[PDB]
Homo-oligomer: A and B are copies of this chain.
Amino acid sequence: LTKLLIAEVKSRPGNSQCCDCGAADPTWLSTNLGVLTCIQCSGVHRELGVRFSRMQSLTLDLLGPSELLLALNMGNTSFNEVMEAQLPSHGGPKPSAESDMGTRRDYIMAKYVEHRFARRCTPQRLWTAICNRDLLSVLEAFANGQDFGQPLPGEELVLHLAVKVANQASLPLVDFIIQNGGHLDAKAADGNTALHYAALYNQPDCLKLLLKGRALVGTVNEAGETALDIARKKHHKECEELLEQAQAGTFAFPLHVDYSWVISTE
């Protein structure tokens, strides 16, 4: 399946040219952004750090369908439509395949850190985008330095709203917020996190994305309930099962106390 999906990714609009320099047949995926770059641009992405871009080679690196969710629903042309909307037809400062590293660095930093080339927008817009399942409007809000930390009027936190209203088609929007929003742990007045909301609204695929994003497991809301409590009480069995495993560290890779080291150390 991953082979079938990778082939699909590479056919997305704009995906036969590096997102940042137009080099033919990019094989480097920014998994949190859903774009493809050449080897030179990918190195620059990597050097931004994990907050901005997480680079894996389609060809060389271990990938599964989850890493491909955004890439299957973004693509270079879509992403650039928002993120290079200020750029002139002739490219301006955008590098080409043979550009020197200094130019290539300066451009990628401007494009992804400062968002220099992105469409400008300036709340109700964001609520509507989320309910519309408009991944590109969510990208635009992020490109305007938006707080996915600030409540939305339709009172609902951005990630909470995305999770509540999620269907299969809108999963990319949820994944995009989890990976790029500042505020995975935000509570909301009654103490519910996005994980509590995924339990409450029976959103097991959201739960998988939150857990993958390292959402906090086993915290309580103002009522004293965990996401697991809510799932059990609602008969949301698929959610309970995921939350039982999370609480048990089905991964998380827990460190253990080394008794020997403790004794030899006091």
Contacts and interface: CB of A to CB of B under 8 A. Distances in A.
Interface of A: 1, 5, 46-47, 49-51, 54-57, 60-67, 69, 149, 168-169, 171, 182-187, 204-205, 207-209, 211-214, 216-220, 224, 226, 242, 245-247, 249-258, 261, 265
21 contacts: A50-B182, A50-B183, A51-B51, A56-B216, A57-B219, A61-B216, A61-B219, A62-B226, A62-B247, A63-B218, A65-B254, A65-B257, A67-B250, A168-B256, A168-B258, A168-B261, A209-B253, A211-B251, A212-B252, A213-B214, A245-B251
Nearest to A241: B253
Nearest to A62: B218
A186 B47 CA distance: 7
Contact of A251 (B64, B149, B171): B64
Contact of A65 (B51, B62, B224, B256): B256
Contact of A214 (B168, B207, B214, B246): B214
A194 to B, nearest CB: 12
Contact of A219 (B62, B169, B242): B62
A50 B250 CA distance: 18
Nearest to A211: B253
A90 to B, nearest CB: 33
A49 B183 contact: yes
A27 B245 CA distance: 26
A165 B63 CA distance: 30
A49 B187 CA distance: 11
A54 B186 CA distance: 10
B1 A205 contact: no
B149 A49 contact: yes
A64 to B, nearest CB: 5
A47 B149 contact: yes
A171 B209 CA distance: 28
Contacts of A251: 64, 211, 245, 249
Nearest to A31: B216
A122 to B, nearest CB: 22
Contact of A253 (B51, B62, B212, B254): B212
Contacts of A183: 49-50
